Write a protein that binds this ligand. Structure first.
Ligand SMILES: Cc1nc(-c2ccc(NCCCCCCN3C[C@H](O)[C@@H](O)[C@H](O)[C@H]3CO)c([N+](=O)[O-])c2)no1
Length: 767
């Protein structure tokens, strides 16, 4: 039955618009298969379309905004695009229709409405680009009856092992199609939908823009050769309309030119499903998905006071839809240094220079291929899997669809190598690499990242302890305990492997110094630190001991290990791994003492990282900020702890961390406040604020000395964080990466959905 729910999940999730790196396209969760993508741009001149055409996601002055209004990867959703440069408001509605044996069918409507500023007679070029990867697969455009192109629908018939037989139709659509009276129309037709069918080696089919442009350029060269010139030139839109040449191939370009508003449908019909998909099917399924989206949201994200209002609901739906709408499927080779150069052990003083030397040997090579099904932080700027971000992404997603979240966790854990390492940044395949400077591609097997995916696991466990097919599937792994347990049984050894990997690779040094502590074992240091940075910790430029030193100990990292042990206690217990649970219990107890013995500063009233002095002694290095609160953020302190009460004072202290807009990453009193790139040195970050909010709530709903302080801080922080993110969204249409504690303004990158979307769960409360 676990096998059964697994196959049903597989069938349910196979298809999607799983290409979040582009405005709109689809692909199934199969490395080498059928992919589609949309392009559009106005044409006003002989040279502008190369500059106006849209395909991969960006964010700049020419684009007001874009995102998902509703989305559920089982059903589909609706995306809105507000394009200033091209004077166009676009809608792309996508819907899946279950049936057959190959993951069902799907359809999309693309609608473009000119904005008030656009010329009423704007010409817009629209391209639907289709490619298929695989040795023994086929795809063919059925020729039109007409001479120069298509009066009606374009039909592609294809086949593969993975998809069986299918047809993909691009409907004629609605809107004025311009007609040219030029001589060229004798050979090219007056203006109509055209199809070019081509082949390239599989590995380059992703390069849709260059492939298209190569065809456009060939058409223009033909014009030149055939005496179409500046004495009497055809109109731009005709110059840029491909000669119709449908056929068989692994690439199919479908091109339309419209004047004024337009729309057209894409209908993917899985043959094994029986009756083919129609436009009327599309409209019905679109209306139905919205209704279901509506009903689920009100149940799962029921926003509590003072956010029950409709403005907050709309806000919540946008923040949530953009988060879950970022889910992509990525496939390909990854770039990894597998030298395990000894310099990477960072055992000496000045280790960063040695590590730089090893990197300069450039032993990294491509490996895999790997696949990953994950949500992402940033469609325009970094549309790919980041390991600790994904822990935050799945907290709202798990609420929505626990089985989906478990799928993503599983996908992440399937990357883990024999040692227990998962790369923190997953750049899979040439398409993903295109977005990343080559200097920043290489992954390092000694680089960890916070294990926030365990937080998601923790939530699943509590749910496990305490309808349409889609509704049923979304909770099958909780509603069927035996299913849930089997999932944990299979994941459990990889979690344990990761635990062990942390302790083998990210170990700090007690025994070699004048260091006394309850445990001789429990001490941690993040590998990969530079003079100015600690990227692996996730808090890039939060101030750390200077200089970096093999004797450093990082309190956040030890806290993370505490998170992991507790999770392993719970899961171990569920699986009756008695021997394991006894070991975990001893480790937890040791971390509890050692956090105090190695990291607590009585003088400062908070936790601090530690180094080793010029005189070879243990020194605490305190920089009041997120790092300082870590045992609290990660749920490690008892509710009656005096230490907790001191952290609550720091948290609430306006002159240190407490801004009107949320908690400051670093205190105003810290010498490093607002210095350098000021990334984690003052701004308000939603992910850490979310952990604070949840821990304040835990203390607030339990007997103890800080109940009432916690309740007040919970109330205020929740309000502050929600309102800041809301005001910004209202003003700008965007979720931002971080928020300015003086002004409240969103800054750094937009489209950060992205853990900023946690705000949905903050609003809905009841932790
Ligand atoms: C115009 C215009 N373009 C841009 C622009 C900005 C940035 C980038 N890439 C930066 C990649 C680094 C991701 C780290 C983010 N974040 C940092 C946290 O510190 C981590 O904790 C966390 O894990 C990760 C992930 O969330 C690109 N670009 O490469 O295309 C373009 N801005 O304006």
């Amino acid at each position: 039955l676990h096998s059964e729910i697994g196959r049903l999940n597989n069938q349910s999730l196979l298809w999607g618009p799983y290409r979040p790196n582009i405005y709109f396209g689809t692909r199934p969760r199969i490395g080498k298969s059928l992919m589609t993508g949309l392009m559009w741009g106005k044409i006003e001149s002989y040279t502008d379309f190369q500059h106006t055409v849209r395909y991969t996601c960006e964010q700049n002055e020419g684009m007001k905004g874009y995102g998902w209004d509703e989305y559920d990867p089982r059903r589909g959703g609706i995306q809105s695009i507000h394009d200033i440069q091209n004077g166009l408001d676009i809608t792309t509605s996508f819907v899946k229709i279950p049936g057959g044996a190959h993951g069902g069918s799907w359809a999309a409507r693309i609608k473009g409405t000119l904005n008030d500023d656009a010329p009423k007679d704007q010409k817009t070029i629209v391209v639907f680009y289709v490619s298929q990867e695989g040795e023994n697969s086929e795809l063919e455009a059925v020729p039109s009856e007409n001479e120069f192109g298509y009066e009606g629908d374009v039909i592609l018939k294809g086949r593969s092992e993975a998809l069986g037989n299918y047809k993909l139709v691009v409907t004629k659509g609605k809107g004025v199609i311009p007609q040219s009276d030029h001589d060229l129309s004798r050979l090219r037709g007056p203006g109509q939908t055209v199809v070019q069918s081509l082949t390239y080696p599989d590995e380059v089919l992703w390069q849709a823009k260059p492939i298209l442009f190569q065809q456009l350029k060939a058409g223009i060269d033909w014009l030149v050769e055939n005496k179409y010139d500046v004495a009497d030139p055809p109109p731009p839109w005709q110059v840029y309309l491909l000669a119709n040449k449908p056929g068989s191939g692994n690439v199919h370009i479908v091109q339309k030119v419209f004047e004024g508003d337009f729309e057209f449908d894409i209908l993917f019909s899985s043959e094994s499903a029986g009756k083919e998909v129609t436009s009327k099917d599309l409209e019905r399924e679109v209306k139905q998905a919205t209704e279901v989206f509506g009903e689920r949201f009100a149940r799962v994200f029921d926003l509590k006071a003072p956010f029950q209002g409709d403005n907050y609901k709309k806000f919540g739906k946008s923040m949530f839809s953009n988060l879950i709408g970022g889910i992509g499927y990525f496939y390909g080779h990854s770039l990894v240094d597998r030298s395990y150069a000894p310099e990477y052990d960072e055992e000496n003083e000045g280790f960063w220079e040695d590590a730089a030397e090893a990197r300069a040997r450039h032993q990294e090579a491509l490996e895999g291929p790997y696949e990953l099904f994950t949500s992402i932080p940033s469609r325009p700027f970094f549309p790919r899997g980041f390991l600790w971000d994904e822990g935050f992404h799945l907290l709202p997603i798990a609420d929505w669809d626990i089985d989906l979240a478990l799928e993503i966790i599983k996908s992440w854990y399937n990357l883990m190598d024999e040692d227990g390492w998962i790369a923190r940044e997953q750049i899979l395949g040439a398409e993903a690499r295109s977005k990343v400077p080559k200097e920043f591609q290489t992954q390092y097997p000694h680089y960890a990242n916070p294990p926030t995916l365990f937080l998601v696991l923790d939530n699943f466990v509590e749910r496990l302890r305490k309808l349409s097919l889609d509704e049923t599937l979304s909770t099958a792994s909780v509603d069927n305990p035996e299913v849930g347990l089997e999932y944990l049984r299979r994941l459990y050894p990889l979690l344990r492997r990761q635990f062990d990997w942390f302790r083998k690779t990210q170990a700090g040094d007690i025994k070699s110094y004048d260091r006394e502590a309850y445990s001789t074992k429990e001490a941690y240091r993040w590998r990969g630190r530079t003079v100015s940075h600690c990227l692996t910790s996730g808090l890039d430029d939060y101030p750390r001991p200077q200089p970096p030193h093999p004797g450093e100990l990082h309190v956040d990292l030890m806290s993370w290990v505490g998170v992991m042990v507790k999770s392993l206690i719970s899961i171990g217990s569920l699986l009756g791994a008695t021997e394991d649970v006894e070991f975990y219990t001893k480790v937890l107890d040791a971390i509890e003492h050692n956090l105090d013995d190695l990291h607590w500063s009585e003088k400062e009233g908070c936790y601090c990282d530690a180094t080793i002095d010029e005189f070879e002694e243990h020194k605490l290095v305190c920089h009041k900020g997120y790092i300082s609160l870590f045992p609290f953020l990660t749920g490690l302190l008892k509710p009656d702890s005096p230490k907790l009460g001191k952290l609550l004072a720091l948290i609430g202290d306006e002159s240190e961390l407490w801004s009107p807009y949320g908690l400051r990453s670093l205190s105003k009193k810290d010498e490093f406040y607002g210095t350098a790139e000021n990334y984690w040195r003052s701004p308000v970050w939603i992910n850490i604020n979310y952990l604070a909010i949840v821990q304040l709530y835990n203390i607030a709903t339990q007997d103890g000395p800080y109940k009432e302080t916690a309740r007040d801080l919970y109330t205020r922080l929740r309000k502050n964080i929600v309102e800041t993110v809301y005001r910004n969204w209202e003003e700008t249409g965007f979720a931002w990466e971080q928020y300015n504690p003086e002004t409240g303004k969103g800054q750094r990158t937009q489209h950060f959905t992205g853990w900023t979307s946690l705000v949905v769960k903050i609003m809905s409360g009841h932790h």
